[PDB]
Amino acid sequence: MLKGKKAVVTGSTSGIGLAMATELAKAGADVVINGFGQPEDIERERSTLESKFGVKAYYLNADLSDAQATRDFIAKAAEALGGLDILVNNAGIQHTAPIEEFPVDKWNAIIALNLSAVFHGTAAALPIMQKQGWGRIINIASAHGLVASVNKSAYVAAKHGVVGLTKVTALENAGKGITCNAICPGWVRTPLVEKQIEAISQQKGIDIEAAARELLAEKQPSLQFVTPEQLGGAAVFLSSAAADQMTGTTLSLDGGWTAR
Amino acid sequence: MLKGKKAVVTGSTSGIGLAMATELAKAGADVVINGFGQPEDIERERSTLESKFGVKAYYLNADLSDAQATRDFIAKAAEALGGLDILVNNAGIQHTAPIEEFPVDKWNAIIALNLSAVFHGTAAALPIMQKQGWGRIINIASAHGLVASVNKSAYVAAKHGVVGLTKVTALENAGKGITCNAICPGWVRTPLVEKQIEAISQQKGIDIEAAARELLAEKQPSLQFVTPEQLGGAAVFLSSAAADQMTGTTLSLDGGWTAR
Amino acid sequence: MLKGKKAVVTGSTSGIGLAMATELAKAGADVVINGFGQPEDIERERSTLESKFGVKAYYLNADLSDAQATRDFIAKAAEALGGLDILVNNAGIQHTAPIEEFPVDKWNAIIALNLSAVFHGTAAALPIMQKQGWGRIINIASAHGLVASVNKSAYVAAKHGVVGLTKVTALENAGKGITCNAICPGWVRTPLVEKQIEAISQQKGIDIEAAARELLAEKQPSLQFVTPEQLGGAAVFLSSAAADQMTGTTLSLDGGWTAR
Amino acid sequence: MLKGKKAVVTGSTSGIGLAMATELAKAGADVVINGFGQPEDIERERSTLESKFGVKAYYLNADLSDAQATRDFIAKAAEALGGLDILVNNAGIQHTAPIEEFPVDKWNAIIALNLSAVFHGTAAALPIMQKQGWGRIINIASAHGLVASVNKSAYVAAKHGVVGLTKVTALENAGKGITCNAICPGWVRTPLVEKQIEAISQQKGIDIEAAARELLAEKQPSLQFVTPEQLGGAAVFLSSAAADQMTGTTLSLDGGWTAR
Numbered sequence A, B, C, D: 001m002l003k004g005k006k007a008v009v010t011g012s013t014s015g016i017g018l019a020m021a022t023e024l025a026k027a028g029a030d031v032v033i034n035g036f037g038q039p040e041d042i043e044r045e046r047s048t049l050e051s052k053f054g055v056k057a058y059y060l061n062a063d064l065s066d067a068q069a070t071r072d073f074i075a076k077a078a079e080a081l082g083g084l085d086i087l088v089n090n091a092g093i094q095h096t097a098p099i100e101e102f103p104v105d106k107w108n109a110i111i112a113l114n115l116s117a118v119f120h121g122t123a124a125a126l127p128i129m130q131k132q133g134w135g136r137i138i139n140i141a142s143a144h145g146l147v148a149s150v151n152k153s154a155y156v157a158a159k160h161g162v163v164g165l166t167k168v169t170a171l172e173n174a175g176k177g178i179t180c181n182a183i184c185p186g187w188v189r190t191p192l193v194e195k196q197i198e199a200i201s202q203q204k205g206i207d208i209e210a211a212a213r214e215l216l217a218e219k220q221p222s223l224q225f226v227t228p229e230q231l232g233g234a235a236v237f238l239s240s241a242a243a244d245q246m247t248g249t250t251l252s253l254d255g256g257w258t259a260r
Ligand SMILES: NC(=O)c1ccc[n+]([C@@H]2O[C@H](COP(=O)([O-])OP(=O)(O)OC[C@H]3O[C@@H](n4cnc5c(N)ncnc54)[C@H](O)[C@@H]3O)[C@@H](O)[C@H]2O)c1
Pocket: A010, A011, A012, A013, A014, A015, A016, A017, A034, A035, A036, A037, A062, A063, A064, A065, A090, A091, A092, A093, A113, A114, A140, A141, A142, A143, A184, A185, A186, A187, A188, A189, A190, A191, A192, A193
């Protein structure tokens, strides 16, 4: 479906990000993964992409909290691939705490990566897409880009901002063959979520899996986690021709989170 | 991808409904088509579904503006197909006029088909899906189920109603293997819209195509119509395993209509 | 102050509606109340409005589930008042049950009163307001006009429809000195809710007040009911000159219900 | 209505901010104004507030793009007022340009003032309100906090982020007697907009008032500017008891902008 396409997924050495690339490569596109982690684990994950899907899978390192590094990352990603058709701004972090106790450094970090990096990434990639007359920018927002939760001020603020940025990107390139949409996932059991599950496990002194059940129960009606593969599935769909007129909107796979 | 699945599409003898029955059949699903029109045309359409995609297709005439007739409809639809996995509530009508001049009969008519029919169809289909532990109810709302336009009170109201009903449907069956989502299309150049394109032409006394380009400009940022095939592509996606945790939400393909 | 203004409120013989009337009379406008109930209790309510606020208060009976009756209702009200500046479509009913078990008569009764009556009421009032060049149509929707809850398909669909109808009314009359907005309340402890609190109290065999605290904890972060008086305050605000440019939007008073 | 209350409004030396302080002072609340400008002009506004409405009024300068300075500012404001009941985060700036051409320094300045400043101001004031057990945090967002417009990436991103931050603030203090809401204005003819009106007057080479008339038509169906005095009345309302259960939501005064 996406043979010959060139995809770039930020923060893809693990979690949802890795699943994104895994699904894009499976669809036939050459992928550029990015993120942190042990060099070996990264290489093994990269090579596995080539072995299983027979596509060119490159790896570029870049700390996206750095504005210039992110923009350089895009140009470098384009050179390795020979172009840039699909951009997935996935990288992001979290920190829990009430507003009055939220560390300025934490607020700045979350905003820098979860919001500003989408901008810099989009800005550097748009010229390439505008020139080609085709493109796909897929921002990974969250149910938290639509509604809020306590003690997540910076995150909820960044995600909401991502949703708005997504809308602007779409309007500025409407009808140019370029679309911009935001995937808003519900709970996905990655290390980012296990941390919150573990905190609950201690605070309430309950079973680990009982805590995970509690975390789901409060926000996800299905009482089932969203899977990284499923989200990858969504990205593949947004990159299809059937989504040619889908732009500046949100794609919620949250098991009912925002229906109530 | 949908081999062995059994689908039903209301208002599918022409326009968007037909294109969605086509995409589903093309995906491997047996289908039940419905609507009005010349019998020979309807037959040729039912006939081509079976020959082109090697699936079983059936046609059942029923005026979904009637509650009981709608309930009889899916009942017979289920018997014909030998089940019911995917239900697409698509049949709808339009009527333009300011509120103080809107005909009571036109209001009742639109709420009846565009909204109540969705409820009756869903209520009759759910027991079958609930029993199986799997199901997909795809409602066709509109960008007008999220925002409004002048002189479309009954339609915007009903479309908004469908979005609410979609949410309730998803919540009641969360985790049961059943999901309910609403496709919210922007401008699709079908007869329902051509009628509005002609009203503009005869109004400003301008080219019919000049009227079409004026229709888009005012609401659809892309300045490109959404195609029936693209909507069907969306239905196929909602029906996939990737959308297992996508429920109670809206899928907008409106060329950026709702982004601004 | 609303001295000189003529206000009309449907379903105002008790509950939110009565508070709506009470706050408008207090602000200085003459009001016409409507609804069912014991004539003794109704005359008391009507009479209290008169002696407590020094305004004229009339009572007009009419089952708003009847399109014509409602249209005749606002015609008389406008006659008894000597005009019509503020209209509050408040009348509403509720039935709780899952879709597949939802009685068709209940679905029809809810749509007819909760949605259709809002359209007919508006239709008949607009010509009068359009002629004066000033008007206010305040629709009492709900948090269920924006989000959903299990077993309230007809109600949620109806309320979502009111939100849409509100947007249309507003656009069709933009700049004419007429605004239309929907107040969307969270839990308000009226006889409509008490019935739901008791069903919880009996169902789970818990204290009646413990049922109330549970009902709130599930949807209202503030853990405090919204009061009919507060909602009446909102209407008075929507009727003020400060709200001249507020139109086609929703006003949520739900203790944070929709924030999450 | 607000006699004895203590209010703080950022960016209140001119424009919407000053109108907010005015209506608050008029309502009887002591106010603290802030913002840039010539010292004599600033003193004048502070002076008129004091004598015209007979309340206390102080001016505290502070470049709110400085986290530490904004936190110190509210500490000084509370000290000057002898408490802090109402905080209105109004300060904001704009810059128009396509994403790929958007200056990074402009992106940073907008996020810092339009979004971060709201966070820091809120963080510093909550402890004070939490102690008294009563509070109002009114955030001035925009229609651009719910929808988008071309060439306003940083601004839309920021405003959406403010909408999200508002919800978190409200949720973290649900029931504590503290509410947080976001006023979402449409076009308001302040210097921030004149600049944009002039740009159209120049580009299209048309009348300055024709440009102002044209700026309205594209987004505001009422074809009327929302006035500063009206937004001030909105803030006065949000501070009233009727809004005790109104929290974590948006109050749109956009003349129908978001209705379509
Ligand atoms: N887990 C959920 O339930 C959930 C829900 C909604 C949205 N999301 C989002 O999905 C995206 C991925 O989150 P996740 O759950 O996979 O977390 P994760 O911890 O599993 O993954 C974060 C990925 O980004 C890398 N990363 C770290 N710092 C980085 C930096 N400075 N620059 C670039 N990459 C960096 C990580 O090493 C990792 O590969 C995020 O932005 C997060 O908002 C997650």
